[PDB]
Design a protein around this ligand. Structure first.
Ligand SMILES: [Mg+2]
Ligand SMILES: [Zn+2]
Ligand SMILES: [Zn+2]
Lengths: 47, 50, 1331
RNA sequence: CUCGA
C-alpha cells in the first residue's frame, strides 16, 4: 500500500531483533566453529 | 450517525488509524503512534498560529 | 522509404543497434577534457572527438580513412557519427518496462489476466507468485504471501516453483501459450450470451491475435538489455566561464550504471537476501526513473530541488520534440518590425525598410555582385555591403523587384492571416502596410508587430504570386462576403460625400456631366451637398458580353456625381444614389465582383480608398463637447422615476407588498424610465431644422459630428451614444443580481464617486473574461484541426443519388435564414420541379449559383435536395461535386484543395467573439401533419397526439410560421382555415398535462379501491372532487402491484371502442391522477377526465459529443408500452410491438415526466421524457441525416445570435469526420464486435460479397465519436502521437505492430515531405501510380 | 516572473 522504498526497507529490517552483549559472543563462537570444521577437515588432503 | 460508521473503539486503537492514514505501509507501535498525534498539533515548534 | 513501422524490440535487436557495452559511470577527465575509457562518452564506442583524429593523435590528416588505432581503439571517421551510434547496458537482473506496466489499461495484466494491484506485489519484493504447480492444489498465478510460502514449501517439497521479482513475471510471460488461450476464448466467446463481458473478451482476443499477427513475443516486455542514447543528443558542453553545462540524462544513466555495478558486486559477495532484494528494487526504481520519471512513486529530484526531465518528458506536452521542434520550427531569412499605415500604396504592395531588405536579401546581393564583376569573390563582396557603398542600393532595386515576400502576424487565426505582398523600398524602420488589408489581419496600429518571411526557390516564388498574393484574397473562405470591405475613415468619407442639404449654395442648377461637377466643386461655386440634375451615361451589359450605353437626366446631388467617375462601366447608377453607409459599400463591391470580374474590382477598391481619404480630409469631422447633446427632458423623467419608486418604498414600509415584489417593481419602473431617455436623446440628435429656399422650417437628418460616426457604421453603435447623452442603464454587481438604483449620470456630466466604483464590476468582469475565453477558443481550434487534417478533395464525381434536404429555419417567429443563401453554392441531388408538379426547371446536378437561385426566389419553391459531404461515397476524401462551391474563388472546388484545415480554421476563428397561446403574425393558410383529431363538445378541435406542429403556410407555399402544439390542447379552429394576424388558435393550460378522453359515451369509475390501491382527497372549497390517487413515494407501498385501471364503460358496462379499431379503451392511473368529473357522467369528445400537473461551452459540448446529465430518452422500437416489474427505485417498462419481438425492456429512473402512459402507442425515435437529447441516440435510432441536421441547426444558433455568419458547409465536414469508426454486428469477413473503419468495412463489401461469394454479410452500425477521441483512433499513429496522450498512443501502437502509411498531411510535415494537397497533390499521384 | 499585441 506504499511506494516509498525506504518504508519497505525499514519494514523489512524491522522484523529482526537487536542483539545483547553475549549474543555477539555466541554468534562469534558459531563463526569460529564453522571455520574450525574446515580447518580440521582439510588435514586429510594432499593440498 | 458518525459514531456507528466509526470503526474504532478505544484510544490506543484510534491513534493507529491516524498513523495508518498519515504514514501508510509502516507497522505501528504505541510509542510512535502517540508521538505522531502529539507532534502534529500540540508542539511548540511544529504548530503555530502566531 | 514510404512507410514507418513500429514494434517491440528484442534483445537481439538492441544488440544489433549497439556498438559496445558501457561499463563505467565516468563521463570525462578533470584535468584534460577527454572522454574516458568505457564511459558514457567513450571514444571507442561512439566515435572520435575531432574530425579524423584518434584520441592519442597517432593518426590524422584524412590519409587513414577508416583505420582503427591499435592504442586507443578509436575508429578514424568524422565527429558527425557521435549523433548516430548507440550503446547498451547489460543488466544484471531483468526489470520491467514502465510503459507496458503502468499505462492504463495495464497491458501486462491484460495479457496475464491478473490485476495490476496483484502484479505490483510481485514487482516489489512483497509476495510470491506460483509459476506452475505440479500438484494442482496451487493453481497458476495464485499469489502466496511471505509466510504461506513456508507452509507450501514443507507440505509439497519441490513439486511447485514460486518466484518473486521481475524474473517471476518474465518466466510467467515466457511460459504461456497464445494458441491455447486464443482458441479457448474464441470458443467461449460464442458460447456465452452477455454484453458486459463481450466488450472485454473481444479486446483480449484481439490483443492475443495482434501479438501473433505482428510477430512479437511477450517476453520482450521485460528489459534485459537497455540501450544508451548517443552522446551528442545529451551533450556536455563547456560554457564561456569554465563551468560545464550538461543535460540531465547523464544523471539517470549514471544511476542505472552505478546500481547495476553494485548489484554485480553484491551477487558475488554472497550477501543475505534483505540486501539483494533491496538492491534489485533499487535497480528497477532507477530504470523506470529514467524511462518515465513521475510515474512510479515520488519523482526523482536533482540538486536544484526540481524533477529531472526523463526520456518520456522529452516527447510530450508543449516542450516535446513533437509540438515544439517538429511541427513548428525557427526559420532563417526572417524579420520582425513595428507596422505603420501608409495610404499611397496599391493593394498588392507593402513598405519595407532599407536596413531590413539589405539583411534579408544578402545572398541574392552576393550573387548579383559577382555576376556583374563588381567584386571578384565573396570575401571581397561582403566588404562592399559592410561599407554600404553606392552600387549596392542600385543593385538592391534590381534584386527586390518582382520578388514577393510574406507577411505573417501572430496569432494566425484563419487562412488570411498570412499574405504575400510586392515590396517597395522606404527609408525608416517600420513596415508600411496597406490600410485595406487590416480587416483580414485584425491589426490595429498601436504597437503591433509583423513577421517578414522570404520565399527562396523558384516554385515558392510562384506560390506567392498566384496563390497568396493580396489581390487574390478579396473573398473570405468563411462566407462569400468580401474581406476588403472598407474600414472607418474611408467609409466616413464616402458617407459625407453622398448626402444632401436643403439650400446648399446653388442647388437646382443643371449640369452636363460628372466632369463639370468637379469643376464646380473645386472652384467653390457649388457645395459638395446640393440637389441638382446631371446627365449621366450608364452601361448595362445584359446583352451577352456587349455593353449598351444609355443616357438620361438624373436628379441627384453633386457628390454622387463627383463619385461616379470612379465606378466601372457595367454597374448602374442605383448603387451610388443612396446615402452610402457601411453595408452599401460592401454590397457595391460584392455586386462589382459578381458582375464584372476580379481585375476591375481591385482597381475599384483601390480608388475607393484613395477617394474616401481625400473627401474626409476636406470636411473636418471633429468631436467637441457641444456635440454630445443632453435631452432637455431628462431631469423630468428621472424626477418622475424618483417619485414612482417612493410609492413602492412606502408600500413596502407598511404591509402591502413583499420584498420580491418590490425588487421587481423597482427594476420594471427603472427600465422604462431608462428607455424614455434613450428615446429622447436619439430623437433630439437626428433632426436639424434648416431654412428652406423660402422662409420656412424644413427638417433634415442631422450633420452632428457624433451622429455621423454612428449612422454611417464607421465607429460605434446606438448603444454607445446612450452612454454619452442618456443615462447608463443598470449596472450589475458580480453576484449576478442587478443593483436597484442605476447610474443616472452619463459620461458628459461626469460620474459620482460611488457610481464610478459601481461601474468597475462590469469592466473588470468583461476584461477578465477575455483573458480566459481565448484559451478555450484557441484550444478548440487545435482540437478541430487535428481531426479534419486529412480531408482533401480527391475525385471529381461519384454517383450517389442522395443528400440532405434544405429548409429555411422557421422557429418561433420570422425566418432567420432564408433559402437564398442557405442553398447557395451546393449542387442539387434530385431534379426539383415547379409547384405545379411537372416541368423540371433545374436539372439533376447543377451548381446553384446567382442567376439560378433568384430564379428559385421568383417561384414558390421551399425545399431543394442537395448533395452533402456527410453522404459522399468515395474513400479517403470527398468528391468535388459532393462538396459544392469554393467559397474563396467562386467556382467549383479543384481536386487538390485541403478542405478540413479551412473548415477547422473557419469554425475556430470567431470563437473569441462569442461569449398557453399561439398567436399568428400575418394572414395565411394553415397546414398540419401526422395528426389524429376529433371534434370537441362545443364545436372546435382537440388534439390527441404528440408529433403535431401547427405550420402557417402563406398564400404561395412557403411556411412562414411553425408552431408546436402539445398533446391534449383544445384548438379554436379546424384544419385548413383562413386566419387573422394576432388571433389565438390554440388554448391549453401551461402548468397541467391533461389526459382528455376521446370517447363519446358514459364513464364509470372501475377497478379502484380507496386505501389500498388509490387515495381520497375532497375539494375543501367547492366539493366537486372524485376518486384520486397519490404520488409514487407518498402512496401506500402495499398496492403498487395492483394497477388502478379506470376502465371507461357505458351505463350498461360494455367496453366502448377506440375510434376506428375494435379494441376497448381504458384510461390508466399514474401518480397525481386527480380526476374531476364524477362517476356515471355522460361525456363527449373534448372532455377532460384528469389534469395531472408537472455560448462557447455549448459548442465545445456539441463537438465533443458529451452525453448530457438529464437526457431526454427515446423509445427504441415501435409498439405498445406497459410497465413490467416493480419499483426497486426504477420500475421497468416493456416495448411490446404489435408485429415484432416482444421482450425488449428498459429501466426508467426519476419519475418526473412520462410523456407516454401505460396504454399509449409510440414509434422509434420519439419523446418519452423531455429535455435535451444526446447526439448518440439520434444516430442509433434515427438516421445519419438526423445527426448532421441536428448539429448544423444547433451550432448555428450560437454563431447566429452573436452576429457571426459562418456557412453551414464547414460544419458537415467535421461531422463527417466524427462518424468515421463503425462497429460491425454480424460477421462473415473479419470478426464479431470489433470497431473497424467504415472505409475498410466498405471496401470489403466492394470486394467480398460481389464476385468472390454471395452475401456473406458485413452489416455494421455507425458510431459517433467526439473530437478528442476521433483523432486518437485513426490509422496513422504519427497523426495521433503529436496530438495528445503520447504515452498511451505509442504504447498501444507498439505491442500491436502498427504500420503507418503517411496518408494524411500532418505526417508529411514531420518527415519533411510534400503534403498531399495543393501543389503537392499533382506530384503525389506520380509517386502513388508508379508503385 | 514583469511587460507589449
Ligand atoms: Mg494592437
Ligand atoms: Zn589512436
Ligand atoms: Zn461524391
Amino acid at each position: 500500500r506504499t511506494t516509498d522504498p525506504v518504508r519497505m526497507y525499514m519494514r523489512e529490517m524491522g522484523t529482526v531483533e537487536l542483539l545483547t552483549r553475549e549474543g555477539e559472543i555466541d554468534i562469534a563462537k558459531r563463526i569460529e566453529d564453522g571455520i574450525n570444521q574446515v580447518q580440521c577437515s582439510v588435514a586429510e588432503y594432499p593440498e | 450517525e458518525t459514531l456507528r460508521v466509526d470503526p474504532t473503539n478505544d484510544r490506543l486503537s484510534a491513534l493507529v488509524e491516524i498513523y495508518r492514514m498519515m504514514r501508510p505501509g509502516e507497522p505501528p507501535t504505541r510509542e510512535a503512534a502517540e508521538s505522531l498525534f502529539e507532534n502534529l498539533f500540540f508542539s511548540e515548534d511544529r504548530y503555530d498560529l502566531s | 522509404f514510404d512507410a514507418i513501422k513500429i514494434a517491440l524490440a528484442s534483445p537481439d535487436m538492441i544488440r544489433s543497434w549497439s556498438f559496445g557495452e558501457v561499463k563505467k559511470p565516468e563521463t570525462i577527465n578533470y584535468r584534460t577534457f577527454k572522454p574516458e575509457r568505457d564511459g558514457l562518452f567513450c571514444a571507442r564506442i561512439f566515435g572520435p572527438v575531432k574530425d579524423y583524429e584518434c584520441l592519442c593523435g597517432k593518426y590524422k590528416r584524412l590519409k587513414h580513412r577508416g583505420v582503427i588505432c591499435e592504442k586507443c581503439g578509436v575508429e578514424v571517421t568524422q565527429t558527425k557519427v557521435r549523433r548516430e551510434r548507440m550503446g547498451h547496458i547489460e543488466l544484471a537482473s531483468p526489470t520491467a518496462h514502465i510503459w507496458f506496466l503502468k499505462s492504463l489499461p495495464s497491458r501486462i495484466g491484460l495479457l496475464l489476466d491478473m490485476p495490476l494491484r496483484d502484479i505490483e506485489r510481485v514487482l516489489y519484493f512483497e509476495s510470491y507468485v506460483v509459476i506452475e504447480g505440479g500438484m494442482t492444489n496451487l493453481e497458476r498465478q495464485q499469489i502466496l504471501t511471505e509466510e504461506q510460502y513456508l507452509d507450501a514449501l514443507e507440505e509439497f517439497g519441490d513439486e511447485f516453483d514460486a518466484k518473486m521479482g521481475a524474473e517471476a513475471i518474465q518466466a510467467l510471460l515466457k511460459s504461456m501459450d497464445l494458441e491455447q488461450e486464443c482458441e479457448q476464448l474464441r470458443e467461449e466467446l460464442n458460447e456465452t450470451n452477455s454484453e458486459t463481458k463481450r466488450k472485454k473478451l473481444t479486446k483480449r482476443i484481439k490483443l492475443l491475435e495482434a501479438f501473433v499477427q505482428s510477430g512479437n513475443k511477450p517476453e520482450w516486455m521485460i528489459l534485459t538489455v537497455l540501450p544508451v542514447l548517443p552522446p551528442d543528443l545529451r551533450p556536455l558542453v563547456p560554457l564561456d566561464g569554465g563551468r560545464f553545462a550538461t543535460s540531465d540524462l547523464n544523471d539517470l544513466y549514471r544511476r542505472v550504471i552505478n546500481r547495476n555495478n553494485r548489484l554485480k558486486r553484491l551477487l558475488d559477495l554472497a550477501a543475505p537476501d534483505i540486501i539483494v532484494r533491496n538492491e534489485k528494487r533499487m535497480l528497477q526504481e532507477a530504470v523506470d526513473a529514467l524511462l518515465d520519471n513521475g510515474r512510479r512513486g515520488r519523482a526523482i529530484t536533482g540538486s536544484n530541488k526540481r524533477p529531472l526531465k526523463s526520456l518520456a518528458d522529452m516527447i510530450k506536452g508543449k516542450q516535446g520534440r513533437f509540438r515544439q521542434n517538429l511541427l513548428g520550427k525557427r526559420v532563417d531569412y526572417s524579420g520582425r518590425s513595428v507596422i505603420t499605415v501608409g495610404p499611397y500604396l496599391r493593394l498588392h504592395q507593402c513598405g519595407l525598410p532599407k536596413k531590413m531588405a539589405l539583411e534579408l536579401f544578402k545572398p541574392f546581393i552576393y550573387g548579383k555582385l559577382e555576376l556583374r564583376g563588381l567584386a571578384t569573390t565573396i570575401k571581397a563582396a561582403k566588404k562592399m555591403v559592410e561599407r554600404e557603398e553606392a552600387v549596392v542600393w542600385d543593385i538592391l532595386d534590381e534584386v527586390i523587384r518582382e520578388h514577393p515576400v510574406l507577411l505573417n502576424r501572430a496569432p494566425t487565426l484563419h487562412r488570411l492571416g498570412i499574405q504575400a505582398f510586392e515590396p517597395v523600398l522606404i527609408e525608416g524602420k517600420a513596415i508600411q502596410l496597406h490600410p485595406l488589408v487590416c480587416a483580414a489581419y485584425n491589426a490595429d496600429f498601436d504597437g503591433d508587430q509583423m513577421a517578414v518571411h522570404v520565399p527562396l526557390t523558384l516554385e515558392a516564388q510562384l506560390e506567392a504570386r498566384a496563390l497568396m498574393m493580396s489581390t487574390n484574397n478579396i473573398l473570405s473562405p468563411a462566407n462569400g462576403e468580401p474581406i476588403i470591405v472598407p474600414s472607418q475613415d474611408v467609409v466616413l468619407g464616402l458617407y459625407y460625400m453622398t448626402r444632401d442639404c436643403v439650400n446648399a449654395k446653388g442647388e437646382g442648377m443643371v449640369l452636363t456631366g460628372p466632369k463639370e461637377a468637379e469643376r464646380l466643386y473645386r472652384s467653390g461655386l457649388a457645395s459638395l451637398h446640393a440637389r441638382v440634375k446631371v446627365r449621366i451615361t450608364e452601361y448595362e451589359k445584359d446583352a451577352n458580353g456587349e455593353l449598351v450605353a444609355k443616357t438620361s437626366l438624373k436628379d441627384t446631388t453633386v457628390g454622387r456625381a463627383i463619385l461616379w467617375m470612379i465606378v466601372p462601366k457595367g454597374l448602374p447608377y442605383s448603387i451610388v444614389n443612396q446615402a452610402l453607409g457601411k453595408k452599401a459599400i460592401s454590397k457595391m463591391l460584392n455586386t462589382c465582383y459578381r458582375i464584372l470580374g476580379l481585375k476591375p474590382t481591385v482597381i475599384f477598391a483601390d480608388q475607393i480608398m484613395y477617394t474616401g481619404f481625400a473627401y474626409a480630409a476636406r470636411s473636418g469631422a471633429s468631436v467637441g463637447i457641444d456635440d454630445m447633446v443632453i435631452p432637455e427632458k431628462k431631469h423630468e423623467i428621472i424626477s418622475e422615476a424618483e417619485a414612482e419608486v417612493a410609492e413602492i418604498q412606502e408600500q413596502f414600509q407598511s404591509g402591502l407588498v413583499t420584498a420580491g415584489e418590490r425588487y421587481n417593481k423597482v427594476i420594471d419602473i427603472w427600465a422604462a424610465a431608462n428607455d424614455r431617455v434613450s428615446k429622447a436623446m436619439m430623437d433630439n440628435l437626428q433632426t436639424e431644422t434648416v431654412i428652406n429656399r423660402d422662409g420656412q422650417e424644413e427638417k433634415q437628418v442631422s450633420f452632428n459630428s457624433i451622429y455621423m460616426m454612428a449612422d454611417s457604421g464607421a465607429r460605434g453603435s446606438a448603444a454607445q451614444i446612450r452612454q454619452l447623452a442618456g443615462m447608463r442603464g443598470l449596472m450589475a454587481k458580480p453576484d449576478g443580481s442587478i443593483i436597484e438604483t442605476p447610474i443616472t449620470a452619463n459620461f458628459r456630466e461626469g460620474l459620482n464617486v460611488l457610481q464610478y466604483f459601481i461601474s468597475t464590476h462590469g469592466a473588470r468582469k468583461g476584461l477578465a473574461d477575455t483573458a480566459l475565453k481565448t484559451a478555450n477558443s484557441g484550444y478548440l481550434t487545435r482540437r478541430l484541426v487535428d481531426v479534419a487534417q486529412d480531408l482533401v478533395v480527391t475525385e471529381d464525381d461519384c454517383g450517389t443519388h442522395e443528400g440532405i434536404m434544405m429548409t429555411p429555419v422557421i422557429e418561433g417567429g420570422d425566418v432567420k435564414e432564408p433559402l437564398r443563401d442557405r442553398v447557395l453554392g451546393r449542387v442539387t441531388a434530385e431534379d426539383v420541379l415547379k409547384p405545379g408538379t411537372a416541368d423540371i426547371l433545374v436539372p439533376r446536378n447543377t451548381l446553384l449559383h446567382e442567376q439560378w437561385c433568384d430564379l428559385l426566389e421568383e417561384n414558390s419553391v421551399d425545399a431543394v435536395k442537395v448533395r452533402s459531404v456527410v453522404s459522399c461515397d468515395t474513400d479517403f476524401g470527398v468528391c468535388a461535386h459532393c462538396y459544392g462551391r469554393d467559397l474563396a474563388r467562386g467556382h467549383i472546388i479543384n481536386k487538390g484543395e485541403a478542405i478540413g484545415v479551412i473548415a477547422a480554421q473557419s469554425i475556430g476563428e470567431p470563437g473569441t467573439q462569442l461569449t398557453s397561446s399561439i398567436q399568428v403574425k400575418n394572414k395565411g393558410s394553415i397546414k398540419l401533419s401526422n395528426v389524429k383529431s376529433v371534434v370537441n363538445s362545443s364545436g372546435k378541435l382537440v388534439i390527441t397526439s404528440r408529433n403535431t406542429e401547427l405550420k402557417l403556410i402563406d398564400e404561395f407555399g412557403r411556411t412562414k410560421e411553425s408552431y408546436k402544439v402539445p398533446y391534449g390542447a383544445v384548438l379554436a379552429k379546424g384544419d385548413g382555415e383562413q386566419v387573422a394576424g394576432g388571433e389565438t388558435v390554440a388554448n391549453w393550460d401551461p402548468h397541467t398535462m391533461p389526459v382528455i378522453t376521446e370517447v363519446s359515451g358514459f364513464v364509470r369509475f372501475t377497478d379502484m379501491i380507496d386505501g389500498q390501491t388509490i387515495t381520497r382527497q375532497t375539494d375543501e372549497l367547492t366539493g366537486l372532487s372524485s376518486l384520486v390517487v397519490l404520488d409514487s413515494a407518498e402512496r401506500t407501498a402495499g398496492g403498487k402491484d395492483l394497477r388502478p385501471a379506470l376502465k371507461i364503460v357505458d351505463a350498461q358496462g360494455n367496453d366502448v371502442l377506440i375510434p376506428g379499431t375494435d379494441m376497448p379503451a381504458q384510461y390508466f392511473l399514474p401518480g397525481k391522477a386527480i380526476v374531476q368529473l364524477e362517476d356515471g357522467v355522460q361525456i363527449s369528445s373534448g372532455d377532460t377526465l384528469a389534469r395531472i400537473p408537472q455560448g462557447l461551452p455549448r459548442v465545445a459540448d456539441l463537438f465533443e459529443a458529451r452525453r448530457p446529465k438529464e437526457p431526454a430518452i427515446l423509445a427504441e422500437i415501435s409498439g405498445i408500452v406497459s410497465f413490467g416489474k416493480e419499483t426497486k427505485g426504477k420500475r421497468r417498462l416493456v416495448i411490446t410491438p404489435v408485429d415484432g419481438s416482444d421482450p425488449y425492456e428498459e429501466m426508467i429512473p426519476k419519475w418526473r415526466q412520462l410523456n407516454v402512459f401505460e396504454g399509449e402507442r409510440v414509434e422509434r425515435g420519439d419523446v418519452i421524457s423531455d429535455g435535451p437529447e444526446a447526439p448518440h441516440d439520434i444516430l442509433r435510432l434515427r438516421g445519419v441525416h438526423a445527426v448532421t441536421r441536428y448539429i448544423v441547426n444547433e451550432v448555428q444558433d450560437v454563431y447566429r445570435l452573436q452576429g457571426v455568419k459562418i456557412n453551414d458547409k464547414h460544419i458537415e465536414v467535421i461531422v463527417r469526420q466524427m462518424l468515421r469508426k463503425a462497429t460491425i454486428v454480424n460477421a462473415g469477413s473479419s470478426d464479431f464486435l470489433e470497431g473497424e473503419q467504415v472505409e475498410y468495412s466498405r471496401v470489403k463489401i466492394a470486394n467480398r460479397e460481389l464476385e468472390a461469394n454471395g452475401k456473406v454479410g458485413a452489416t455494421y452500425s455507425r458510431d459517433l465519436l467526439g473530437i478528442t477521441k476521433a483523432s486518437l483512433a485513426t490509422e496513422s499513429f504519427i497523426s495521433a502521437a503529436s496530438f495528445q496522450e503520447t504515452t498511451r498512443v505509442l504504447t498501444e501502437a507498439a505491442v500491436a505492430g502498427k504500420r503507418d502509411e503517411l496518408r494524411g498531411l500532418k505526417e508529411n510535415v514531420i518527415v519533411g515531405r510534400l503534403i498531399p494537397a495543393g501543389t503537392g497533390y499533382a506530384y503525389h499521384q506520380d509517386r502513388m501510380r508508379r508503385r
